[PDB]
Design a protein around this motif. Structure first.
Motif, PDB file in Angstrom:
ATOM      1  N   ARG B  23       0.422  -0.691  -0.068  1.00 47.03           N
ATOM      2  CA  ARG B  23      -0.086   0.220   0.167  1.00 47.03           C
ATOM      3  C   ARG B  23       1.064   1.173   0.160  1.00 47.03           C
ATOM      4  N   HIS B  24       2.119   1.392   0.907  1.00 49.17           N
ATOM      5  CA  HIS B  24       3.143   2.454   0.561  1.00 49.17           C
ATOM      6  C   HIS B  24       3.525   2.756  -0.126  1.00 49.17           C
ATOM      7  N   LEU B  25       2.856   3.570  -1.246  1.00 45.77           N
ATOM      8  CA  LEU B  25       3.301   3.696  -2.200  1.00 45.77           C
ATOM      9  C   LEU B  25       5.814   4.151  -3.167  1.00 45.77           C
ATOM     10  N   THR B  26       5.829   4.951  -2.014  1.00 46.96           N
ATOM     11  CA  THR B  26       6.881   4.701  -1.465  1.00 46.96           C
ATOM     12  C   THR B  26       8.071   3.645  -2.013  1.00 46.96           C
ATOM     13  N   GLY B  27       7.348   2.677  -0.538  1.00 51.33           N
ATOM     14  CA  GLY B  27       7.754   2.161   0.019  1.00 51.33           C
ATOM     15  C   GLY B  27       8.137   0.900  -1.605  1.00 51.33           C
ATOM     16  N   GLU B  28       7.336   1.258  -2.252  1.00 49.96           N
ATOM     17  CA  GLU B  28       7.163  -0.107  -3.527  1.00 49.96           C
ATOM     18  C   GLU B  28       8.201   0.235  -4.511  1.00 49.96           C
ATOM     19  N   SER B  29       7.843   1.502  -4.782  1.00 46.47           N
ATOM     20  CA  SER B  29       8.819   2.022  -5.994  1.00 46.47           C
ATOM     21  C   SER B  29      10.335   1.280  -5.142  1.00 46.47           C
ATOM     22  N   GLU B  30      11.078   1.820  -4.231  1.00 42.40           N
ATOM     23  CA  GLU B  30      11.725   2.168  -3.722  1.00 42.40           C
ATOM     24  C   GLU B  30      12.289   0.431  -2.870  1.00 42.40           C
ATOM     25  N   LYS B  31      11.897  -0.175  -2.945  1.00 44.84           N
ATOM     26  CA  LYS B  31      11.874  -1.641  -2.724  1.00 44.84           C
ATOM     27  C   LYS B  31      12.837  -2.205  -3.258  1.00 44.84           C
ATOM     28  N   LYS B  32      13.842  -3.327  -2.426  1.00 48.55           N
ATOM     29  CA  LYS B  32      15.349  -3.346  -2.220  1.00 48.55           C
ATOM     30  C   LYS B  32      14.762  -4.803  -2.335  1.00 48.55           C
ATOM     31  N   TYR B  33      15.907  -5.550  -3.466  1.00 53.72           N
ATOM     32  CA  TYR B  33      15.433  -7.261  -3.451  1.00 53.72           C
ATOM     33  C   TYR B  33      16.914  -8.026  -2.691  1.00 53.72           C
ATOM     34  N   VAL B  34      16.461  -8.682  -1.828  1.00 51.87           N
ATOM     35  CA  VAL B  34      17.731  -9.188  -1.049  1.00 51.87           C
ATOM     36  C   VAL B  34      17.814 -11.311  -1.975  1.00 51.87           C
ATOM     37  N   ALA B  35      18.739 -10.901  -2.635  1.00 57.08           N
ATOM     38  CA  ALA B  35      18.913 -12.216  -3.719  1.00 57.08           C
ATOM     39  C   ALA B  35      19.134 -13.672  -2.878  1.00 57.08           C
ATOM     40  N   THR B  36      20.289 -13.556  -1.695  1.00 53.47           N
ATOM     41  CA  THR B  36      20.551 -14.394  -1.119  1.00 53.47           C
ATOM     42  C   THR B  36      19.367 -15.126   0.272  1.00 53.47           C
ATOM     43  N   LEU B  37      18.425 -14.341   0.130  1.00 60.50           N
ATOM     44  CA  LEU B  37      17.213 -14.821   1.521  1.00 60.50           C
ATOM     45  C   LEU B  37      15.538 -14.533   0.766  1.00 60.50           C
ATOM     46  N   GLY B  38      15.615 -14.489  -0.651  1.00 62.48           N
ATOM     47  CA  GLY B  38      14.627 -13.973  -1.332  1.00 62.48           C
ATOM     48  C   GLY B  38      13.914 -13.342  -1.025  1.00 62.48           C
ATOM     49  N   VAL B  39      14.002 -11.950  -0.508  1.00 72.00           N
ATOM     50  CA  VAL B  39      13.402 -11.141   0.426  1.00 72.00           C
ATOM     51  C   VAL B  39      13.341  -9.426  -0.043  1.00 72.00           C
ATOM     52  N   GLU B  40      11.631  -8.375  -0.353  1.00 71.90           N
ATOM     53  CA  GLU B  40      11.869  -7.726  -1.536  1.00 71.90           C
ATOM     54  C   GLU B  40      12.136  -6.668   0.234  1.00 71.90           C
ATOM     55  N   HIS B  42      11.203  -3.738   1.866  1.00 70.90           N
ATOM     56  CA  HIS B  42      10.241  -2.117   1.044  1.00 70.90           C
ATOM     57  C   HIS B  42      10.754  -0.743   2.715  1.00 70.90           C
ATOM     58  N   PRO B  43      11.110   0.372   2.027  1.00 69.01           N
ATOM     59  CA  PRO B  43      11.245   1.264   2.727  1.00 69.01           C
ATOM     60  C   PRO B  43      10.173   2.127   2.850  1.00 69.01           C
ATOM     61  N   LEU B  44       9.557   1.809   3.837  1.00 68.00           N
ATOM     62  CA  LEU B  44       8.638   3.234   4.664  1.00 68.00           C
ATOM     63  C   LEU B  44       8.736   4.302   5.185  1.00 68.00           C
ATOM     64  N   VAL B  45       8.716   5.538   5.158  1.00 68.45           N
ATOM     65  CA  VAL B  45       8.627   6.426   5.679  1.00 68.45           C
ATOM     66  C   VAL B  45       7.501   6.977   6.741  1.00 68.45           C
ATOM     67  N   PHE B  46       7.386   7.143   7.683  1.00 67.95           N
ATOM     68  CA  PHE B  46       6.293   7.787   7.925  1.00 67.95           C
ATOM     69  C   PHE B  46       7.454   9.424   8.910  1.00 67.95           C
ATOM     70  N   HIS B  47       6.380  10.414   9.072  1.00 65.51           N
ATOM     71  CA  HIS B  47       6.635  11.637   9.274  1.00 65.51           C
ATOM     72  C   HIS B  47       6.217  12.370  10.407  1.00 65.51           C
ATOM     73  N   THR B  48       6.578  11.772  11.481  1.00 58.42           N
ATOM     74  CA  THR B  48       6.602  12.373  12.998  1.00 58.42           C
ATOM     75  C   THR B  48       6.120  13.253  13.218  1.00 58.42           C
ATOM     76  N   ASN B  49       5.811  13.622  14.938  1.00 59.26           N
ATOM     77  CA  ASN B  49       6.417  15.001  15.687  1.00 59.26           C
ATOM     78  C   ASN B  49       7.871  15.613  15.421  1.00 59.26           C
ATOM     79  N   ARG B  50       8.551  14.600  15.958  1.00 56.94           N
ATOM     80  CA  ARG B  50       9.968  14.274  15.863  1.00 56.94           C
ATOM     81  C   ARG B  50      10.987  14.332  14.655  1.00 56.94           C
ATOM     82  N   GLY B  51       9.986  14.210  13.340  1.00 60.10           N
ATOM     83  CA  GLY B  51      11.000  14.440  12.449  1.00 60.10           C
ATOM     84  C   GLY B  51      10.700  12.567  11.712  1.00 60.10           C
ATOM     85  N   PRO B  52      11.201  12.082  10.927  1.00 56.87           N
ATOM     86  CA  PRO B  52      10.892  10.524   9.826  1.00 56.87           C
ATOM     87  C   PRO B  52      11.371  10.035  10.642  1.00 56.87           C
ATOM     88  N   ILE B  53      10.862   8.809  10.523  1.00 54.43           N
ATOM     89  CA  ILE B  53      11.184   7.743  11.026  1.00 54.43           C
ATOM     90  C   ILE B  53      10.679   6.503   9.291  1.00 54.43           C
TER      91      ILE B  53
END
Ligand code: GDP
Ligand code: MG
Ligand code: ZN
Lengths: 38, 203
Positions: B23-40, B42-53
């Motif tokens: 569902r998280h569009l940037t997490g999908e467009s910026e996803k990274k494939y880990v071939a050794t483990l067969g994993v994607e 997804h970097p999901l950024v959320f903006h908090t009152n103290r900054g991005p996480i």
């Protein structure tokens, strides 16, 4: 900017370029995916 | 230097893990494939009152359909979502196995339990039956990946637990794929109320 209010910098830790796991300086390969330390 | 957490997303095949993380569009467009483990990852950024996480969410490539996941999948996870399908009771019955496998490698990291597909009318696993989280210091939420219902709740709860700030807020929702099904607002209110009622009742 992309930082977080109050965050701490730890020395030597390296972010795996393959899986983004944060590794210890003494680890020469990513403890998760086995990628070599950049 | 940014704040980021490895989040492992586990649960039976077919429960909607991939649909959810996507569902998280940037997490999908910026996803990274880990071939050794067969994993994607997804970097999901959320903006908090103290900054991005950033939650680096590890999504399988379906290997959970054939047994447990390798240690490398779990290693250095800082938090987790265990997902089941509220239309399939067996997926809920397997929640304890996933929890066991996770804690074996990661110990007691913060974990959210999510019952997915609550948009489907004929629900089988209802609030009164969902008790594993109460038994193990876990937070629970109903979710519907296809409608984005409660999408941010697991991540907000985890952020608060990891950062040690119960007043942390997300200043805005991340950009999400538009709902493919409508979550009936009245049904959502009813399910939330049912969960409260069950929370007050004894096991
Ligand atoms: N009605 C409904 N279907 C969903 C939802 N999430 C996933 N599905 C579907 O469940 C099937 C498996 O989803 P998938 O993301 O591949 O599950 P995974 O194996 O856990 O990764 C697919 O047909 C999804 O379209 C949801 O929230 N509501
Ligand atoms: Mg999947
Ligand atoms: Zn790695």
């Amino acid at each position: 900017g992309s930082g977080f209010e109050g965050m701490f910098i730890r020395k030597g830790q390296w972010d795996c370029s393959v899986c983004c796991v944060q590794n210890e300086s003494s680890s020469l390969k990513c403890v998760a995916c086995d990628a070599s330390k950049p | 230097p940014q704040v980021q957490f490895k989040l492992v997303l586990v649960g039976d095949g077919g429960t909607g893990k991939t649909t959810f993380v996507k569902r998280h569009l940037t997490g999908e467009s910026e996803k990274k494939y880990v071939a050794t483990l067969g994993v994607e990852v997804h970097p999901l950024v959320f903006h908090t009152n103290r900054g991005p996480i950033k939650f680096n969410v590890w999504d399988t490539a379906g290997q959970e359909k054939f047994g447990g996941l390798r240690d490398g999948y779990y290693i250095q996870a800082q938090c987790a979502i265990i997902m089941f399908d509220v239309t399939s009771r067996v997926t809920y019955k397997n929640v304890p196995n996933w929890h066991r496998d996770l804690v074996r490698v990661c110990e007691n990291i913060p974990i959210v339990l999510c019952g997915n597909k609550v948009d489907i009318k004929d629900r089988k696993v209802k609030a009164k039956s969902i008790v594993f989280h109460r038994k193990k210091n876990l937070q629970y939420y109903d979710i519907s990946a296809k409608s984005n219902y409660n999408f941010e709740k697991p991540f907000l709860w985890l952020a608060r637990k990891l950062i040690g700030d119960p007043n942390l807020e997300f200043v805005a929702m991340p950009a999400l794929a538009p709902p493919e099904v409508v979550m009936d607002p009245a049904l959502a209110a009813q399910y939330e109320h049912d969960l409260e009622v069950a929370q007050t009742t004894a096991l």
